[PDB]
Ligand SMILES: *[C@@H]1O[C@H](CO)[C@@H](O[C@@H]2O[C@H](CO)[C@@H](O[C@@H]3O[C@H](CO[C@H]4O[C@H](CO)[C@@H](O)[C@H](O)[C@@H]4O)[C@@H](O)[C@H](O[C@H]4O[C@H](CO)[C@@H](O)[C@H](O)[C@@H]4O[C@H]4O[C@H](CO)[C@@H](O)[C@H](O)[C@@H]4O)[C@@H]3O)[C@H](O)[C@H]2NC(C)=O)[C@H](O)[C@H]1NC(C)=O
Ligand SMILES: *[C@@H]1O[C@H](CO)[C@@H](O[C@@H]2O[C@H](CO)[C@@H](O)[C@H](O)[C@H]2NC(C)=O)[C@H](O)[C@H]1NC(C)=O
Ligand SMILES: *[C@@H]1O[C@H](CO)[C@@H](O[C@@H]2O[C@H](CO)[C@@H](O)[C@H](O)[C@H]2NC(C)=O)[C@H](O)[C@H]1NC(C)=O
Ligand SMILES: *[C@@H]1O[C@H](CO)[C@@H](O)[C@H](O)[C@H]1NC(C)=O
Ligand SMILES: *[C@@H]1O[C@H](CO)[C@@H](O)[C@H](O)[C@H]1NC(C)=O
């Protein structure tokens with residue numbers, strides 16, 4: 001079962017009984033369809049990458065620099081077989097943005113919900129249900145491994161908040177370094193974040209100097225409205241994108257459909273995606289799709305003009321001749337003035353800051369490593385052998401301190417968290433793209449918009465900010481900007497007993513230790529993981545752990561970072 005009333009003119013209707021107004025967190029289309037995918041990870045040394053430049057190593061999903069798309073319809077069940085044929089590295093496949101409702105075992109977080117799949121052809125078949133529709137991506141959680149090429153896309157078909165004719169498809173944008181993920185982890189352990197060596201466009205790159213590589217083409221059909229699925233799968237860079245000659249109508253933020261909001265330029269934090277509509281009401285010519293940067297505290301590239309080519313049907317095979325206008329500095333901040341079509345509502349008029357709901361982000365500049373990120377006084381450092389689920393599926397509640405477990409006992413109530421971005425640090429404060437596993441959150445509010453490099457600090461003040469907090473259907477998504485030198489307020493509803501990572505999606509920072517682990521409804525969760533139903537999941541879990549704990553001691557390399 002796919003659509004039965006989903007047409008160019010009526011995108012809001014999907015099938016009888018489901019549409020763009022249907023609360024997807026309650027009613028899910030029962031389609032008796034399952035879809036299977038296979039993903040095979042290989043490793044390649046001394047390889048020639050997208051832009052002709054030698055890469056000392058890369059790790060590829062299905063022999064390409066970018067993994068395939070996991071496609072399916074809202075409601076279908078999904079089984080994805082990850083085969084790890086890497087030489088030495090373990091792996092954890094995470095399905096970013098998936099709610100994993102009551103399905104923690106398949107989240108894909110090593111040391112948290114699973115043991116890493118061993119190299120040399122060890123595997124696991126991840127099973128899960130599409131209880132959402134929209135655009136996302138998947139990627140390794142095994143250290144910074146995805147920055148080596150272990151990344152890919154998701155696209156579950158569903159309704160839309162705005163009609164359109166063509167659906168171009170996913171459009172992954174991802175920063176590109178000639179250095180390897182492990183060299184960059186080692187580099188940033190005592191150096192600031194480097195710029196990218198290039199930007200990829202849906203799995204392609206063109207070199208600034210040698211003019212090698214190639215421009216990526218997107219074709220437009222004069223007049224017809226198109227839908228573009230933009231993903232930022234980077235490890236660091238936050239992209240400002242724009243299309244010369246055209247505006248872009250937002251109709252989805254992350255896995256959440258939203259009321260049509262048109263923009264001229266759009267800011268993409270790491271992990272964020274947006275679904276824009278593009279009306280091709282322009283002259284049959286060629287138009288730059290530009291990548292630009294704001295404050296360098298959230299990225300830059302050695303490629304000063306990365307772009308792709310959007311071409312009208314009938315247009316020649318020339319290049320765009322209009323270099324476009326100047327793009328405004330989005331100051332390392334994603335826009336919040338977006339209205340979800342399915343509405344939510346939390347009380348905000350009652351928020352009172354205290355230890356039990358406040359997460360303090362800090363950078364310990366000490367020694368070995370020089371740069372270390374900590375939350376609430378602790379750097380997270382999971383154990384690839386003994387995952388939190390283990391402590392849960394047994395009586396042991398003696399979790400290690402470095403697992404930074406934040407327990408939440410509230411049963412299906414709203415829960416408020418104020419993240420503070422190192423406010424007493426006079427020397428530095430960086431923007432962080434915060435991501436929650438297992439939930440979408442409402443973005444209740446954040447400190448006043450600032451230019452990061454101006455160093456303007458903001459601590460939470462009840463007298464100024466409570467009037468600015470929004471509890472009546474804010475933006476809700478899985479990624480949002482913690483402001484530089486500021487603070488962010490968030491809420492999710494503990495409706496999914498599990499252990500959920502809450503971390504920074506900058507590979508360098510989360511390797512540095514910038515994460516906590518929400519142990520949500522441990523009582524309910526244990527009963528779940530142990531129930532008859534889960535036998536096949538718990539047994540697989542237990543199985544992949546056995547082969548990893550056995551392999552581990554044969555590994556020639558140590559664990560250099562937190563593991564995440
Ligand atoms: C980034 O790079 C990737 C490549 O990795 C590229 O992805 C390619 O994306 C496109 C668009 O997302 C994919 O094209 C579509 O495939 C679906 C489903 O395919 C399945 O079914 C067919 C049936 O034989 C099988 O062959 C196939 O193997 C799959 O099982 C189709 O449904 C799509 O066709 C629809 O849209 C087309 C126009 O885009 C129409 O020609 C076609 O008639 C269909 O339109 C219909 O659907 C509408 C509903 O919305 C309906 O209202 C209309 O009336 C009509 O019924 C299309 O073929 C492609 O498979 C991807 N994979 C590749 C090529 O590797 C991205 O495109 C790229 N990103 C950008 C932006 O460049
Ligand atoms: C969008 O990208 C295009 C192509 O990369 C940019 O075109 C360049 O413009 C700069 C201006 O300094 C020139 O130095 C380059 O020679 C141009 N390259 C080409 C191929 O023409 C364009 O500048 C970009 N537009 C925006 C808004 O950033
Ligand atoms: C995962 O694979 C990569 C490639 O082997 C490992 O990175 C190498 O590891 C050593 C020891 O840490 C480094 O000194 C080298 O710089 C790395 N090689 C390159 C070219 O990047 C990494 O250590 C492996 N992780 C595991 C699971 O051991
Ligand atoms: C885009 O078109 C150019 C020339 O028209 C071609 O060289 C290039 O390979 C194309 N890009 C893709 C995605 O193949
Ligand atoms: C894009 O929007 C801006 C203002 O939002 C306006 O200047 C411009 O005319 C618009 N262009 C098109 C083609 O929609």
Ligand SMILES: *[C@@H]1O[C@H](CO)[C@@H](O)[C@H](O)[C@H]1NC(C)=O
Nearest residue numbers: 355356357358359360376406
């Ligand atoms: C931060 O740590 C303090 C003291 O260890 C603890 O009381 C509090 O619960 C922590 N805050 C959060 C958000 O867990």
Ligand SMILES: [Cu+2]
Nearest residue numbers: 096139271505
């Ligand atoms: Cu992710």
Ligand SMILES: [Cu+2]
Nearest residue numbers: 096097436437
């Ligand atoms: Cu995630």
Ligand SMILES: [Cu+2]
Nearest residue numbers: 432504506509
């Ligand atoms: Cu960070």
Ligand SMILES: [Cu+2]
Nearest residue numbers: 435437501503
């Ligand atoms: Cu994560």
